[PDB]
Coordinates of C-alpha atoms and ligand atoms in Angstrom, one line a residue:
Chain A
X1 CA -67.2 -18.1 -46.4
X2 CA -68.6 -16.6 -43.5
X3 CA -69.2 -12.9 -42.1
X4 CA -68.1 -12.0 -38.7
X5 CA -68.3 -8.7 -36.8
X6 CA -67.0 -8.5 -33.4
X7 CA -68.4 -5.7 -31.3
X8 CA -66.7 -4.4 -28.2
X9 CA -65.3 -1.0 -26.7
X10 CA -61.9 0.5 -27.7
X11 CA -60.3 -1.4 -25.1
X12 CA -58.2 -4.7 -24.9
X13 CA -60.6 -5.9 -22.2
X14 CA -63.0 -9.0 -23.1
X15 CA -63.1 -8.4 -26.5
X16 CA -59.4 -8.6 -27.5
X17 CA -59.6 -12.6 -27.1
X18 CA -61.9 -12.7 -29.8
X19 CA -59.7 -10.5 -31.9
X20 CA -56.5 -12.4 -31.3
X21 CA -58.1 -15.5 -32.1
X22 CA -59.1 -14.2 -35.4
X23 CA -55.5 -13.1 -36.5
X24 CA -54.3 -16.1 -35.5
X25 CA -56.4 -17.9 -37.8
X26 CA -55.6 -15.4 -40.0
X27 CA -59.5 -14.4 -40.8
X28 CA -61.0 -11.5 -41.9
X29 CA -63.6 -10.0 -39.8
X30 CA -65.2 -6.2 -38.6
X31 CA -63.4 -4.9 -35.2
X32 CA -66.2 -2.8 -34.7
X33 CA -64.5 -0.8 -32.0
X34 CA -67.7 0.9 -30.3
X35 CA -67.8 4.5 -28.7
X36 CA -68.8 5.4 -25.5
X37 CA -71.1 7.8 -27.1
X38 CA -73.1 4.8 -29.1
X39 CA -73.2 2.6 -26.2
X40 CA -76.5 3.7 -24.2
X41 CA -78.5 3.2 -27.2
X42 CA -77.3 -0.1 -28.2
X43 CA -77.0 -1.6 -24.4
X44 CA -81.1 -2.6 -24.6
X45 CA -80.7 -4.1 -27.9
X46 CA -78.0 -6.3 -26.8
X47 CA -79.0 -10.1 -25.2
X48 CA -77.8 -9.5 -21.8
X49 CA -76.8 -5.7 -22.1
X50 CA -73.3 -6.0 -22.2
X51 CA -70.2 -6.5 -24.8
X52 CA -68.5 -8.6 -26.3
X53 CA -71.1 -9.5 -29.2
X54 CA -70.1 -11.8 -32.1
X55 CA -72.2 -11.6 -35.3
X56 CA -72.1 -14.4 -37.4
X57 CA -73.7 -13.4 -40.8
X58 CA -76.5 -11.6 -39.2
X59 CA -76.9 -13.8 -35.8
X60 CA -75.7 -12.5 -32.4
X61 CA -73.9 -14.5 -29.9
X62 CA -73.0 -12.8 -26.5
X63 CA -70.7 -13.9 -23.6
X64 CA -67.0 -13.8 -24.1
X65 CA -66.0 -17.6 -23.1
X66 CA -68.7 -18.9 -25.8
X67 CA -67.5 -16.6 -28.5
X68 CA -64.1 -17.9 -27.7
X69 CA -64.9 -21.1 -27.9
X70 CA -66.9 -20.6 -31.3
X71 CA -64.4 -19.0 -32.9
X72 CA -61.8 -21.6 -31.9
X73 CA -63.8 -24.7 -33.3
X74 CA -64.5 -22.7 -36.2
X75 CA -60.7 -22.8 -36.8
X76 CA -59.1 -25.6 -35.5
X77 CA -58.2 -23.8 -32.6
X78 CA -59.8 -25.9 -29.7
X79 CA -58.0 -29.0 -29.5
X80 CA -57.7 -32.3 -31.9
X81 CA -60.1 -35.0 -29.8
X82 CA -63.3 -34.1 -27.8
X83 CA -61.7 -34.6 -24.5
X84 CA -58.7 -32.0 -25.6
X85 CA -61.4 -29.6 -26.4
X86 CA -62.8 -30.3 -23.0
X87 CA -59.2 -29.9 -21.5
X88 CA -58.8 -26.5 -23.0
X89 CA -62.5 -25.5 -21.7
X90 CA -61.3 -26.7 -18.4
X91 CA -57.9 -24.7 -17.7
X92 CA -59.8 -21.5 -19.1
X93 CA -62.3 -22.3 -16.6
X94 CA -59.5 -22.1 -14.0
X95 CA -58.2 -18.6 -15.4
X96 CA -61.4 -17.3 -15.1
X97 CA -61.6 -18.3 -11.7
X98 CA -58.3 -16.2 -11.0
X99 CA -59.5 -13.3 -13.2
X100 CA -62.6 -13.3 -11.0
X101 CA -60.3 -12.6 -7.9
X102 CA -58.7 -9.6 -9.4
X103 CA -60.7 -8.3 -11.8
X104 CA -63.2 -6.7 -9.3
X105 CA -60.0 -4.8 -7.7
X106 CA -58.5 -3.9 -11.2
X107 CA -59.7 -0.3 -10.9
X108 CA -58.3 1.0 -7.7
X109 CA -55.3 -0.9 -9.3
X110 CA -55.1 1.1 -12.2
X111 CA -55.8 4.1 -9.8
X112 CA -59.2 4.6 -11.6
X113 CA -60.9 4.4 -8.1
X114 CA -60.2 5.5 -4.9
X115 CA -58.5 2.9 -3.0
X116 CA -55.4 2.0 -0.9
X117 CA -53.2 0.4 -3.3
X118 CA -50.8 -1.3 -1.3
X119 CA -53.8 -2.9 0.8
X120 CA -55.3 -4.7 -2.1
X121 CA -51.7 -6.1 -3.8
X122 CA -50.9 -7.7 0.2
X123 CA -54.7 -8.6 0.7
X124 CA -56.6 -9.7 -2.2
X125 CA -53.5 -9.8 -5.7
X126 CA -50.7 -11.7 -4.4
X127 CA -52.7 -14.4 -2.6
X128 CA -54.9 -15.0 -5.5
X129 CA -51.6 -15.0 -7.6
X130 CA -49.8 -17.2 -5.5
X131 CA -52.8 -20.0 -5.3
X132 CA -53.4 -19.7 -9.1
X133 CA -50.3 -19.5 -11.1
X134 CA -48.7 -22.3 -9.6
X135 CA -52.5 -24.2 -10.7
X136 CA -51.3 -22.8 -14.1
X137 CA -47.8 -23.5 -14.4
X138 CA -48.5 -27.4 -13.1
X139 CA -51.2 -27.8 -15.5
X140 CA -48.5 -26.4 -18.1
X141 CA -46.4 -29.2 -16.6
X142 CA -48.4 -31.8 -17.8
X143 CA -48.0 -31.1 -21.4
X144 CA -44.4 -30.9 -21.7
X145 CA -45.3 -29.4 -25.1
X146 CA -45.4 -25.6 -24.8
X147 CA -49.3 -24.9 -24.8
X148 CA -51.7 -25.8 -22.2
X149 CA -53.3 -28.9 -24.2
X150 CA -51.4 -30.4 -27.2
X151 CA -48.7 -29.3 -29.4
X152 CA -50.1 -26.3 -30.8
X153 CA -51.4 -23.3 -29.6
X154 CA -55.4 -23.3 -29.1
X155 CA -57.9 -20.3 -28.1
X156 CA -57.3 -20.9 -24.1
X157 CA -53.5 -19.8 -25.0
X158 CA -54.3 -16.9 -26.7
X159 CA -56.4 -15.5 -24.2
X160 CA -54.9 -16.7 -21.1
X161 CA -51.5 -15.3 -22.4
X162 CA -52.5 -11.7 -23.6
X163 CA -54.5 -11.3 -20.2
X164 CA -51.6 -12.1 -18.0
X165 CA -49.4 -10.1 -20.1
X166 CA -51.6 -7.2 -19.0
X167 CA -51.8 -7.8 -15.9
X168 CA -48.4 -8.0 -15.7
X169 CA -48.2 -4.2 -16.5
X170 CA -50.8 -3.4 -12.9
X171 CA -48.8 -5.6 -10.5
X172 CA -45.0 -5.4 -10.2
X173 CA -43.2 -9.1 -10.2
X174 CA -46.5 -10.4 -11.1
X175 CA -45.0 -13.7 -12.7
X176 CA -41.5 -13.3 -10.6
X177 CA -41.2 -16.9 -9.6
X178 CA -42.8 -18.8 -12.5
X179 CA -40.5 -18.8 -15.5
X180 CA -42.3 -21.6 -17.2
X181 CA -45.5 -19.1 -17.2
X182 CA -42.9 -16.4 -18.7
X183 CA -41.8 -18.6 -21.2
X184 CA -45.1 -19.6 -22.1
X185 CA -46.5 -16.0 -22.4
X186 CA -43.3 -15.3 -24.8
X187 CA -43.8 -18.0 -27.1
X188 CA -47.2 -17.7 -27.8
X189 CA -46.7 -13.8 -28.3
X190 CA -43.9 -14.7 -30.8
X191 CA -46.0 -16.4 -32.9
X192 CA -46.0 -14.5 -36.3
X193 CA -49.5 -13.5 -36.7
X194 CA -50.1 -12.6 -33.0
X195 CA -46.5 -10.8 -32.5
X196 CA -47.7 -8.8 -35.7
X197 CA -51.4 -8.4 -34.4
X198 CA -49.5 -6.7 -31.1
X199 CA -47.7 -4.3 -32.7
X200 CA -50.4 -3.0 -35.3
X201 CA -53.1 -3.2 -32.4
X202 CA -54.0 0.1 -30.8
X203 CA -52.2 1.0 -27.5
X204 CA -54.9 1.0 -24.7
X205 CA -54.6 1.4 -21.1
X206 CA -56.3 -2.1 -20.3
Chain B
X1 CA -66.6 -45.8 -21.9
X2 CA -66.4 -46.1 -17.6
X3 CA -67.8 -42.7 -16.4
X4 CA -66.5 -41.6 -12.3
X5 CA -68.1 -38.6 -11.1
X6 CA -66.2 -37.0 -8.0
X7 CA -67.9 -34.8 -5.9
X8 CA -69.2 -34.5 -2.6
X9 CA -72.2 -35.5 -0.8
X10 CA -74.3 -32.2 -1.6
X11 CA -75.9 -31.2 -5.1
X12 CA -73.9 -28.1 -5.7
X13 CA -71.8 -28.1 -8.4
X14 CA -71.7 -31.8 -9.2
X15 CA -75.3 -32.2 -9.7
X16 CA -75.2 -30.6 -13.0
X17 CA -73.3 -33.8 -14.2
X18 CA -75.8 -36.2 -12.3
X19 CA -78.5 -34.5 -14.1
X20 CA -76.6 -35.0 -17.6
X21 CA -76.2 -38.6 -16.8
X22 CA -79.9 -39.6 -15.8
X23 CA -81.3 -37.3 -18.8
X24 CA -79.2 -39.7 -21.2
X25 CA -79.7 -42.6 -19.5
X26 CA -75.8 -43.3 -19.2
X27 CA -74.3 -45.2 -16.2
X28 CA -71.7 -44.1 -14.0
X29 CA -70.1 -43.9 -10.7
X30 CA -71.9 -41.6 -8.7
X31 CA -68.7 -41.1 -6.2
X32 CA -69.6 -39.0 -3.4
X33 CA -66.2 -38.3 -1.3
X34 CA -66.7 -37.6 2.5
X35 CA -64.6 -34.8 4.2
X36 CA -62.0 -37.3 5.9
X37 CA -61.0 -38.0 2.5
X38 CA -60.6 -34.6 1.2
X39 CA -57.2 -34.0 2.5
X40 CA -55.5 -36.5 1.0
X41 CA -57.1 -36.5 -2.4
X42 CA -56.9 -32.7 -2.9
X43 CA -53.4 -32.6 -3.7
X44 CA -53.5 -35.5 -6.1
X45 CA -56.4 -32.9 -8.2
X46 CA -55.5 -30.9 -11.5
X47 CA -56.9 -27.4 -9.9
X48 CA -57.1 -28.5 -6.0
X49 CA -61.3 -28.6 -6.1
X50 CA -64.1 -31.1 -7.5
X51 CA -65.9 -32.1 -9.0
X52 CA -63.9 -34.1 -11.3
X53 CA -65.0 -36.5 -13.9
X54 CA -62.8 -39.2 -14.9
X55 CA -63.1 -41.6 -18.5
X56 CA -61.2 -44.2 -18.7
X57 CA -58.4 -43.3 -16.6
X58 CA -58.2 -39.8 -17.6
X59 CA -59.0 -36.8 -15.2
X60 CA -61.3 -33.7 -16.0
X61 CA -62.0 -30.8 -13.8
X62 CA -64.2 -28.0 -13.7
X63 CA -68.2 -28.2 -13.7
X64 CA -68.5 -26.5 -16.8
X65 CA -66.1 -28.2 -19.2
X66 CA -67.2 -31.3 -17.2
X67 CA -71.2 -30.2 -18.4
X68 CA -70.4 -29.2 -21.9
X69 CA -68.3 -32.3 -22.6
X70 CA -71.0 -34.6 -21.3
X71 CA -73.6 -33.2 -23.1
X72 CA -71.7 -33.4 -26.2
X73 CA -71.1 -37.1 -26.0
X74 CA -75.1 -38.0 -25.3
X75 CA -76.2 -34.8 -27.9
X76 CA -77.4 -32.9 -25.3
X77 CA -75.3 -29.9 -26.4
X78 CA -76.8 -28.6 -29.4
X79 CA -78.0 -29.8 -32.8
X80 CA -75.6 -27.1 -34.8
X81 CA -72.2 -25.2 -34.0
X82 CA -74.5 -22.2 -33.2
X83 CA -76.9 -23.8 -31.0
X84 CA -74.1 -24.9 -29.3
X85 CA -72.6 -21.7 -28.8
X86 CA -76.0 -20.5 -27.8
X87 CA -75.9 -23.3 -25.3
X88 CA -72.9 -21.7 -23.9
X89 CA -73.8 -18.0 -23.7
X90 CA -76.9 -18.3 -21.8
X91 CA -75.1 -20.7 -19.0
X92 CA -72.7 -17.9 -19.3
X93 CA -74.9 -15.8 -18.5
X94 CA -76.1 -17.9 -15.4
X95 CA -73.3 -18.2 -13.8
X96 CA -72.8 -14.4 -13.5
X97 CA -76.0 -14.5 -12.0
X98 CA -74.8 -17.0 -9.7
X99 CA -71.5 -15.1 -9.2
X100 CA -73.6 -12.5 -7.4
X101 CA -75.4 -15.1 -5.6
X102 CA -73.3 -17.5 -4.5
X103 CA -70.6 -15.5 -2.3
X104 CA -73.6 -14.9 -0.1
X105 CA -75.1 -18.0 0.4
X106 CA -73.7 -19.6 3.8
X107 CA -74.8 -16.3 5.6
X108 CA -78.4 -16.4 3.9
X109 CA -77.9 -20.3 5.2
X110 CA -76.5 -19.8 8.0
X111 CA -73.2 -21.3 8.3
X112 CA -71.4 -18.0 8.7
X113 CA -72.4 -15.0 10.9
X114 CA -74.1 -12.3 9.1
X115 CA -77.4 -10.3 8.8
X116 CA -79.5 -12.0 6.7
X117 CA -81.7 -9.1 5.8
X118 CA -79.2 -6.8 4.8
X119 CA -78.1 -8.9 2.1
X120 CA -81.3 -10.0 0.6
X121 CA -82.0 -6.4 0.5
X122 CA -78.6 -4.7 -1.0
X123 CA -77.1 -8.4 -3.1
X124 CA -79.7 -10.8 -3.4
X125 CA -82.7 -9.0 -4.6
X126 CA -80.6 -6.9 -6.9
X127 CA -79.1 -9.8 -8.3
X128 CA -82.3 -11.3 -9.2
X129 CA -84.2 -8.2 -10.4
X130 CA -81.3 -7.8 -12.9
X131 CA -80.9 -11.3 -13.7
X132 CA -84.0 -12.8 -13.8
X133 CA -85.5 -10.9 -16.8
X134 CA -82.4 -11.5 -19.2
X135 CA -83.2 -15.5 -18.9
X136 CA -86.8 -15.1 -19.3
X137 CA -85.8 -12.8 -22.6
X138 CA -83.8 -15.1 -23.9
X139 CA -86.4 -18.1 -23.3
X140 CA -88.9 -15.8 -24.7
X141 CA -87.0 -16.0 -27.6
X142 CA -87.0 -19.4 -28.1
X143 CA -90.1 -20.1 -29.0
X144 CA -89.6 -23.6 -27.7
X145 CA -89.9 -24.6 -23.8
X146 CA -86.1 -24.8 -23.6
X147 CA -83.2 -21.9 -23.7
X148 CA -82.1 -23.1 -27.3
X149 CA -83.6 -25.2 -29.7
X150 CA -86.4 -27.6 -29.6
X151 CA -85.3 -30.2 -26.8
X152 CA -83.5 -30.1 -23.8
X153 CA -79.7 -29.4 -23.2
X154 CA -77.3 -29.6 -20.4
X155 CA -77.6 -26.1 -19.3
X156 CA -81.3 -26.3 -18.8
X157 CA -80.9 -29.0 -16.9
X158 CA -78.1 -27.1 -14.7
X159 CA -80.3 -24.0 -14.7
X160 CA -83.6 -25.0 -13.7
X161 CA -81.9 -27.5 -10.9
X162 CA -79.9 -24.7 -9.4
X163 CA -83.0 -21.9 -9.7
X164 CA -85.3 -24.2 -7.9
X165 CA -82.7 -24.9 -4.9
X166 CA -82.4 -21.1 -4.5
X167 CA -86.2 -20.6 -3.7
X168 CA -85.6 -21.8 -0.7
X169 CA -82.8 -19.2 0.4
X170 CA -84.2 -16.3 -1.4
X171 CA -88.0 -15.2 -0.4
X172 CA -90.1 -15.2 -3.5
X173 CA -87.4 -15.6 -5.1
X174 CA -89.5 -16.7 -8.3
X175 CA -92.4 -14.4 -7.6
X176 CA -92.7 -12.3 -11.1
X177 CA -91.6 -14.7 -13.2
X178 CA -94.5 -17.4 -14.2
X179 CA -92.0 -18.2 -17.4
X180 CA -89.2 -18.8 -15.5
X181 CA -91.4 -21.3 -13.3
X182 CA -93.1 -23.0 -16.0
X183 CA -89.9 -23.8 -17.9
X184 CA -88.2 -25.1 -14.7
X185 CA -91.0 -27.4 -14.0
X186 CA -91.1 -28.3 -17.4
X187 CA -87.8 -29.2 -17.5
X188 CA -88.0 -31.2 -14.2
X189 CA -91.0 -33.0 -15.5
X190 CA -89.5 -35.1 -17.8
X191 CA -89.3 -38.8 -17.0
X192 CA -85.4 -39.3 -16.3
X193 CA -85.2 -35.9 -13.9
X194 CA -88.2 -36.1 -12.3
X195 CA -87.2 -39.8 -11.6
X196 CA -83.5 -39.1 -10.3
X197 CA -85.0 -35.9 -8.4
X198 CA -87.4 -38.2 -6.5
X199 CA -84.4 -41.2 -6.0
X200 CA -81.7 -38.7 -5.1
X201 CA -80.0 -38.0 -1.7
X202 CA -82.0 -35.8 0.2
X203 CA -80.0 -32.6 0.8
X204 CA -80.3 -29.0 1.4
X205 CA -78.4 -28.1 -1.2
Ligands
GSH1 N1 -69.8 -12.6 -18.7 C1 -69.6 -11.3 -19.5 C2 -68.8 -10.1 -18.9 C3 -68.9 -8.7 -20.0 C4 -69.0 -7.9 -19.4 O1 -68.9 -7.3 -18.0 N2 -69.0 -6.5 -20.3 C5 -68.6 -5.0 -19.9 C6 -67.0 -4.8 -20.5 S1 -65.9 -5.5 -20.1 C7 -69.7 -4.3 -20.5 O2 -70.2 -4.6 -21.7 N3 -70.1 -2.9 -19.5 C8 -71.0 -2.3 -20.1 C9 -72.3 -2.8 -19.4 O3 -72.6 -3.5 -18.4 O4 -73.3 -1.6 -19.6 C10 -68.4 -11.5 -21.0 O5 -67.6 -12.6 -20.8 O6 -69.1 -11.6 -21.9
GSH2 N1 -64.5 -23.2 -10.7 C1 -64.7 -24.3 -10.3 C2 -65.1 -24.3 -8.5 C3 -65.2 -25.7 -7.9 C4 -65.0 -25.6 -6.1 O1 -65.1 -24.3 -6.1 N2 -65.2 -26.9 -5.3 C5 -65.4 -26.8 -4.1 C6 -66.7 -27.0 -3.7 S1 -68.1 -26.3 -4.4 C7 -64.3 -26.7 -3.4 O2 -63.5 -28.1 -4.2 N3 -63.9 -27.1 -2.2 C8 -62.8 -28.0 -1.5 C9 -61.4 -26.8 -1.5 O3 -61.5 -26.4 -2.5 O4 -60.6 -27.7 -0.9 C10 -65.9 -25.5 -10.8 O5 -66.5 -24.6 -11.6 O6 -65.4 -26.8 -10.9

């Protein structure tokens, strides 16, 4: 019977991954969404000067992926064997590589930063998309099941599909050409607890 | 359990796995691949990249996933679920640091054209000044000589090895951080590590 507090900004972003993992498992936690007002005071008190942070009975854990994995293993959403857990880690790291291409160009694409959206799409987004999506889809085809690894949902599934779904809003036809991913995203987000959470969670830009 | 690590001749991302094996005294095929063989292998890999670890025939990709898998197998991952997550956390912070530098490696090394001085002042030195204190802070809270717990973990082995390599490419890379240097020495003092460091193929990186 452990007590959980997640500290992140109002947006979904990196924090949403943890939230999704809680709601899937049906585990209650404090969704501490932090006001911009309070960030300057908290920042120097954090391990690395950033959020998200997970508090577990007082103890602090930083870095989102470490948070995802910790929650995943605690809730049996990490894989049924040691090699499976690794395969889960593996596919998410590849997703992380993909994100490493896109995220630095997010704000120009969202319009928050001055720049040539059309250029970025052709010179950064669409090439990244074209390289990485086939690799995620290939991996997904190993399984034959509806998930990247195993016959049931894992934490990597929850975080990946949510992020891809959101990026579909910034980039038209982002998933066009990859229906196996489109189904995969449709499936995970139709899971009852996820489906519920998506309906109730705050509407934020990203 | 037959262990086979596939990577290129250089240390790079593959070295992390090698260090974890040697520290645990576990035997493995250190398969270092010729450039000549990369075009044929690449399409037959999960993500088109190395390193790969295969154990009894099954292939595992992505270096960090390889580090953690091996570390957990050899009791080098942490002593509790929270300690394990903490090992992941400090290493993820370390990857963020590397994410700043690694894209600038080839210019700093001279494999690609560019102003080395400008890169140092505008990217390398800033990245260093932001991140080293964070690593040093995390190490300082530990009390022990390692990032987490009282014994060495896979994150210690990969971090210290990587930090040691970057001394070369960045002037005074660890100048104002006596704690980090001592920690790098200590982890690399460990018998199996000191041994492997001496035996391993002399590559620059
Ligand atoms: N590698 C970190 C990245 C965390 C991160 O970049 N957080 C941003 C928000 S997405 C942040 O805290 N910005 C405020 C700041 O850095 O001062 C992780 O995965 O958790
Ligand atoms: N995210 C991957 C990165 C692996 C990677 O970038 N490998 C490079 C060498 S360091 C490679 O395979 N280059 C050959 C190629 O991609 O075709 C990991 O951590 O394992």
